[PDB]
Amino acid sequence: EQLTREELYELFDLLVQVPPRTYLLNIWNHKNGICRQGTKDLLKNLRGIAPKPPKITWQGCSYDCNMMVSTLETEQTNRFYNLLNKKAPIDEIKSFIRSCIDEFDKLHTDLYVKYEKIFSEQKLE
Amino acid sequence: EQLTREELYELFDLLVQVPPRTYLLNIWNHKNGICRQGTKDLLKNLRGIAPKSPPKITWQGCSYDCNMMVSTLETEQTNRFYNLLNKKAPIDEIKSFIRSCIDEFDKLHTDLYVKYEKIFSEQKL
Ligand SMILES: [Hg+2]
């Protein structure tokens, strides 16, 4: 039952107090599902404009993108558990989760911009 | 003074509660300055590749199109910003919005560059 981003942010107002940790972990799994669908969408969009100067291949783009997103996911999850363990207020936790999603959106933007330029230049000459 | 992108992102993490309107307007003006420098950089780069049946695309046309696209996006984003202010959006939502507007401008700048790179390349034969 994957929550949409909209449903997650609405649910972030039903949390006026810090909920139990199981609840918090459930929310983080929905966060992961949202970011991972963003990655799937990025790779789908990049595959569309990849060709069939630099000599970057689809396999290279895919390795780079997957390494950046997988490393970001690990780093964010670690920051999440540290927030939990230090018993942070609910407002801080909510801002942290929304900021992690924003950070993934910026990474997906950075990757799209980077490869849009390379692929478009390869399609030339 | 004009904040760098990195300085603006730093401020975002220091808005933890909802700040006065003057502060948010000030942040928006720095956002505008960052996106306008991105537009200046785009036109500089495009000048490098500009020339020196259907009509030939010239520097004038390229410049008119780019400035219309970025100026209209500026207007539309500012109108969405004022909507959030007036509806008293919580700070996490405003922060996501401003971050997303900068991503949208980065994408537009890249889309424009790729568009003209292709057009100027094809004409050159
Ligand atoms: Hg460029």
Topology, please?
Two copies of one chain form a homodimer.
Chain A: H1 5-14, H2 21-49, H3 58-85, H4 90-122
Bound molecules: mercury (II) ion.
Residues 45, 113 of chain B line the site of mercury (II) ion.
Keywords (chain A): Signal
Protein name (chain A): Plasmodium RESA N-terminal domain-containing protein
Domain Plasmodium RESA N-terminal (chain A): 2-115
Question: How would you characterize this protein structure?
Answer:
The structure is a homodimer of 125-residue chains. With 125 residues, the first copy, chain A, is mainly alpha-helical. The first copy, chain A, has one domain (5-122). Chain A is 80% helix and 0% strand. Chain A has helices at 5-14, 21-49, 58-85, 90-122. Chain A starts with a helix and ends with a helix. Residues 45, 113 of chain B line the site of mercury (II) ion. Chain A: This is Plasmodium RESA N-terminal domain-containing protein. Chain A: Residues 2-115 form the Plasmodium RESA N-terminal domain. Chain A: Keywords: Signal. Chain A: It comes from Plasmodium falciparum (isolate 3D7). It is classed as protein binding. The entry lists the keywords four-helix bundle structure, protein binding.
